[PDB]
């Protein structure tokens, strides 16, 4: 009873112990593990992000407000201008601009030991876009800025004539972001961006960092650009289901028509409001691979000129910080772990699998 | 003598060359290795650490230094008030309040294309703490903060009269730390803390790294708790032991009474000073697990008021850099390593372990 | 014919497909691959950057373009003093100097309860350098500071006395580095550095990463002394390869005389200028090990004074990123994950390879 007893037991034991942890390494493989590696890349040429300023939303804006409060109308009912044969919705929203068509943009990249700073005029030039503020101006920063050391900025500068007339802004709503995600501009200027006084020049510094996420099979990717038209989609779609009035406003694509009266403007105005405070939850769309993170520091640095808006943008750092998230146990991984927990507790190598496999056919 | 002593030769070989290295695998086991691995979490609400603001340290203050002076006393000798009727020790620090009862602080988390900022005024507000810079103002910072956009921030403001009477403060230490650890608040805000001017309203932004310690038996964690119990109990023995004076000032925890004579109160005053300068060196406990990084930056953004102190703290950046390191080396690993190890140089796995038993049993 | 061709089909399958397996593992191993490890250091006691401070370039400097404007020249041309009996061109580069030899540094590295800061005025002090920007000051900071909390900081100060006789400076170029390497500072200081006022007090905040390279066989380092030897030589061989004259001025070592004529002065200095700029890419020398990024924030403290310059650096975070490339696959890896697939697809595991030794030896 001893010998074949005993053989059996200690065979068994094996067969369970090996089964047991095989199962757990292929257990360890269905459930996407991911791990992170973080680097450090230097940059030779700067991916920069396309800038939109913004004056303050639209009762915080001091410009609008005044044209406003002149017309009867106060910082609430601001709306209420529509119902007027010399107002439109669009004509209400070019009463916000605080840019003069002087609006321009250059990149200083470099600088020399006679001349000083390279001076670069000809790039994206900034356009006019309508966004929830009001009336925007959105800076494409479309080609890569070379990095020549600290001193590599982009000066953004609307030059207009302060001819005391009536009262003139006092902060800007800036936001960095990326290209052709027409959600970013329009919708979300006044929430992400950055509320800065245009009294005197001042200077930002962007570093980069860029979260990489794996398109595993439990937390799928969309890339970035399926990722800003699901969103708009959502945005837009919710906001006509809520406000309940098939009209737009000019922060909107143009599906279909503006509603050239108070009542059903305020409800989509009202509606966009409340829906883009909350999007991220109610969305059924998913985190982008490439998230880009732009670390704003604030520079106390020299230049003073005497126009309106004297904006800099810095990119002292070449060095991005890239944390990407890869699945750390492949296929390649699971058999190769198999076949060690395998051949660990048994000695059966495919080699040795082949022979029984020949054995068994003869 | 070819034969066998060859086959003793490459058998001794082998033993030789596996036992050395299984030696080395659970030698490298005993050693606990710890690997770092960093991850960038996305939070959705964001742990405000609880801030403690105190004015400068009493030499430094423009108003406890001037009544210290009006009394004949000068900036040095400031506790020989106490020897006076009418003066005890806690009116001394009582004298350095900077902060009127009209202090609060808001929570803006969020922003509105109608309204503009959310506010919300009921959170934890500030109550009086006794420190060594004086008597400060404490901000417990409990609740979480939801994270909408950049625009979330604690606005903290205090409202006084400056009906021009007596020379009002120039400067305020800001301090951000974590909660229940009552010697942060007490003792080290005049050394960690920011001294910044409150002539106008400035702004904070934090972002947060979290570094985690592996608990291994040469290097072990004692918790932010049992870390901070332990700091506080040793600095304030530690003071004892060095002023020889049986009392305490209003900065210690109430264990005993307040000695209402300058002789030790200087005493306690000075033992305190030169204690709290080196307690990590002398301080016998160890490294918490989870040390706090508020990376604070300082944010020129757009905001004036006309009162005395209007303070800013912007959390712009909901991604938390956790850098945590791990025992890289397991049981189950140096198990594993041991088998492969074995396996690969004499080819017997368990199995044949299992087998051999078997065999010597019978 | 059946069973044993079906043997030497299942032997010559599994020798070839453990044979790639062994050739990509090998394959896998002459392409040395690197992995990033990063860890947060606590510093002790941390490694000052030895700062350079420049006045603006030439054409910048506004006493420099004073003296220049007022013998005649304009600032475009400032190298024609050259052809004057009183002035060489050790005269034309002492007229950039903005500090006066009442400049210092002192270290601020804690701060009392009673005292204040401490204040240690005798460290490495600043001592006068010739740049491409002019005649500029250094300040060695050789010294290590140890870490006190946030109000560990290296103030320089030059205290020269404002009587208004001739217009005075409003700007200057910071650049921190490390040290021996006299390319950073007499080349590099007005490319790299910042431009900041000199109108009030400043300060900045520095943080330090650290990115390591592997001295891998297919990206070798030199280490940052020999890198800095390699750049210097190179840009000063270029710059008389390019100049076609062979003089120097006084921002080169002393290789050879001063030239004292404008015309073949004009020739160095844009020689320099147009060689500096891109000598990243015409230098065939390579990558530092040792990368020290620094990352510098503006820090708007309370501490102003009456002086001319009153520059603060603050060390506020002694957490020191290190990301280090190290190779992620060694010898003893390869021969183990070698002796694995063989031993996973033959079973022959080294002893077995002994016995057949023997057994062919007989």
């Not at 007027?84 to 003069?100: C, G, H, K, Q, T």
Request: with cysteine; aromatic share 12%; hydrophobic share 40%.
């Amino acid at each position: 009873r001893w010998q074949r007893a005993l053989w059996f037991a200690g065979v068994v034991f094996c067969f369970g112990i090996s089964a047991h942890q095989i199962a757990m390494h292929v257990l360890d493989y269905l459930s996407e593990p991911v791990a992170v590696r973080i680097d450090f890349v230097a940059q030779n040429e700067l991916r920069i992000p396309e800038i939109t300023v913004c004056p303050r939303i639209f009762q915080q804006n001091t410009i609008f407000t005044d044209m406003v409060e002149k017309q009867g109308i106060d910082k609430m009912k601001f709306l209420d201008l529509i119902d007027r044969p010399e107002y439109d919705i669009m004509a209400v929203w070019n009463l916000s601009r605080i840019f003069s068509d002087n609006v321009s943009c250059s990149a200083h990249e470099g600088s020399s030991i006679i001349s000083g700073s390279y001076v670069d005029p000809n790039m994206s030039q900034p356009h006019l876009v309508y966004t929830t503020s009001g009336q925007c101006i959105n800076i494409p920063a479309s080609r890569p800025l070379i990095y020549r050391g600290v001193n590599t900025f982009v000066r953004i500068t609307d030059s207009q004539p302060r001819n005391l007339d009536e009262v003139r802004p006092e902060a800007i709503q800036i936001y960095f972001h990326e290209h052709h995600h027409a959600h970013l501009s329009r919708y979300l200027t006044g929430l992400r961006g950055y509320i800065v006084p245009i009294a005197n020049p001042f200077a930002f510094s962007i570093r980069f960092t860029q979260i990489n996420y794996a398109n595993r099979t439990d937390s799928p990717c969309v890339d970035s650009e399926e990722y800003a038209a699901c969103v708009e989609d959502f945005i837009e779609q919710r906001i006509y289901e809520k406000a309940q009035v098939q009209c737009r406003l000019p922060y909107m694509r143009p599906k279909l028509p503006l509603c050239s009266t108070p009542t059903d403007a305020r409800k989509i105005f009202v509606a966009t409001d409340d829906v883009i405070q909350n999007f991220e939850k109610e969305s059924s769309c998913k985190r982008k691979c490439e998230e880009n993170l732009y670390i704003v520091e604030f520079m106390h640095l020299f230049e003073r000129s005497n126009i309106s808006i004297d904006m800099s943008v810095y990119f002292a750092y070449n060095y991005i910080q890239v944390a990407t998230e890869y699945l750390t146990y492949t296929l390649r991984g699971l058999l190769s772990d198999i076949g060690g927990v395998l051949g660990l507790f048994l000695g059966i190598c495919i080699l040795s699998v082949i022979e029984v496999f020949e054995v068994v056919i003869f």
